[PDB]
Amino acid sequence: KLEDGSQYPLEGRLEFSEVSVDEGTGSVTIRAVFPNPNNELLPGMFVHAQLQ
Amino acid sequence: ILKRLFKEGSDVKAGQQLYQIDPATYEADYQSAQANLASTQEQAQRYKLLVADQAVSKQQYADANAAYLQSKAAVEQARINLRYTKVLSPISGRIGRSAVTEGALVTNGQANAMATVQQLDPIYVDVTQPSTALLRLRRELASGQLERAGDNAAKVSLKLEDGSQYPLEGRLEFSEVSVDEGTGSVTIRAVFPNPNNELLPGMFVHAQLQE
Amino acid sequence: ILKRLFKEGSDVKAGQQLYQIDPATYEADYQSAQANLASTQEQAQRYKLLVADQAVSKQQYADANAAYLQSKAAVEQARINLRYTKVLSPISGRIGRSAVTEGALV
Amino acid sequence: ILKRLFKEGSDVKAGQQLYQIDPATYEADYQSAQANLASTQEQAQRYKLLVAD
């Protein structure tokens, strides 16, 4: 779901292998991969991954 | 620097000579390399025929062929250096000021440029906008809500800083050229014809989209 | 930099040439090194035969072999430098602005 | 001997060219000597002034 509140039409995979853990916070970062064939998404966008 | 061949702030063509570095010493190396080559070549040719006839040893032919190869090499380097005495314009555009005065000493690999040329006719207008604004606009190009100007571009107008309209009409191209660090904000470019140089780099302006 | 070769904000491929560094001297060094190699090599090969026959000394052969070894080395470095005059994309992806202009020094 | 230019047994005039010796190396030595003179002459003109100040 994009900053504008809109739904990205494509759908990706949320990968559960941890990329980094935080120092103080101890909170983990993981990553989803989304196809981006029109170059609608660019780095630095604020978004929400939606999980059922 | 023998000469500066251009007027500062003028329009220069791609490949036009902007400076003449004093060629005299470079001409001398070249012509001297060619003289050395003409001689060693004629010998190497003679010896190639002699060694075929066994009128000379392999060594003597070898030595003659070696001298010739050295000469060949020396010519080619000298030719290149001579060519470089004419400092040429890489592009068509408005050249600025010379950082160098006639009679100054220039060095291959010196830290500072001597001049800077700027293609001004087609001119850019850099527009920075939040990632979401751009995504919106791109959709309207495909929706047809925005009028196209060629491939992947919207027709645009320009409003100058004095507040007036620019008479000409440009292209707002949708491939991003940078995304900013702090802000998610994206920079794209419009392209406006500038046939008399009313537009200059550094102006603050407003590109205008009819939706 | 002789040429930039890519549009800013466009897609390039891994391995694609993004810039042309002026190759003229590098080309000349390489051609000349290569021709010198052909010549020191035959000389070293020949002296190798000739020492076995005692028609030249070990010192003469040692010198011929040395000059040949230097030519090999000179050729390899000249080749590598010439190769780098073509600045390639490491990956496929979207390229942004050029931070360096044509005519710039790298 | 690049060329003979005359027919054996024939008549010839004083100053008539009878042979051409290959001039390639001679042409290039001459071109090079002119080039060295130009360069070297300008430098001595230049240094004549320099030493003056």
**CATH number of the domain within which B32 lies:** 1.10.287.470
Whether residues C92 and C56 fall in one domain = no
- Judging contact as 3 or more Cβ pairs under 8 Å, the answer for A and B is yes
Identity (one letter) of the amino acid at B52?
A
Whether residues C14 and C36 fall in one domain = no
Asked if the C-beta of D36 comes within 8 angstroms of chain B's C-beta atoms, the answer is yes
Whether residues C33 and C58 fall in one domain = yes
Whether residues B169 and B66 fall in one domain = no
What is d(CA A45, CA B127) in angstroms, rounded to the nearest whole number?
18
Q: What is the CATH number of the domain that holds C101?
A: 2.40.50.100
What is d(CA C50, CA D32) in angstroms, rounded to the nearest whole number?
40
Asked whether B149 and A14 are in contact (CB, 8 A), the reply is: no
* Residues within 8 A of B (CB atoms), C 64-103 only: 96-97, 102-103
CB contact under 8 A, C32 and B91: no
Asked whether B186 and B130 are in contact (CB, 8 A), the reply is: yes
Chains that touch C (3 or more CB pairs under 8 A): B
What is d(CA A9, CA A51) in angstroms, rounded to the nearest whole number?
15
Collect all residues with Cβ–Cβ distance below 8 Å to B81 and sequence separation of at least 6: B26, B29, B30
Asked if the C-beta of C45 comes within 8 angstroms of chain B's C-beta atoms, the answer is no
Give the resolution value in Å: 2.4
Whether residues B149 and B205 fall in one domain = yes
Angle at C31 between CA C27 and CA C35, to 5 degrees: 170
Whether residues C39 and C67 fall in one domain = yes
Number of domains within chain B:
3
Whether residues B99 and B2 fall in one domain = yes
Whether residues B58 and B101 fall in one domain = no
Q: Nearest residue on chain A to B179, judged by CA atoms? A: A43
Identity (one letter) of the amino acid at A33?
V
Cβ atoms < 10 Å from Cβ of A19 = 9
Whether residues C75 and C30 fall in one domain = yes
Q: Which helix (H) or strand (E) holds A8?
A: none
Of B135, B138, B184, which is closest to A44 when you measure between CB atoms?
B184
Whether residues C28 and C67 fall in one domain = yes
Helix pair angle (D24-52, B24-52), 10° resolution: 150
CB contact under 8 A, B24 and D38: yes
Asked whether C88 and C94 are in contact (CB, 8 A), the reply is: no
B83 CB neighbours in chain C (<8 A) are: 24
Structural domain boundaries, residue B159: 120-211
Whether residues B7 and B102 fall in one domain = yes
- In the numeric block, the tokens 């989304």 are attached to A34
Cα distances from A1 to residues A51, B46, B136, B139, B185, in angstroms, run 11, 82, 14, 16, 18
Collect all residues with Cβ–Cβ distance below 8 Å to C42 and sequence separation of at least 6: B62
CB contact under 8 A, C39 and B176: no
Q: What is the CATH number of the domain that holds B151?
A: 2.40.30.170
Please count the residue pairs, one from chain B and one from chain D, whose beta carbons lie less than 8 angstroms apart.
45
CB contact under 8 A, D28 and B42: no
What is d(CA B130, CA B206) in angstroms, rounded to the nearest whole number?
16
Whether residues B129 and B177 fall in one domain = yes
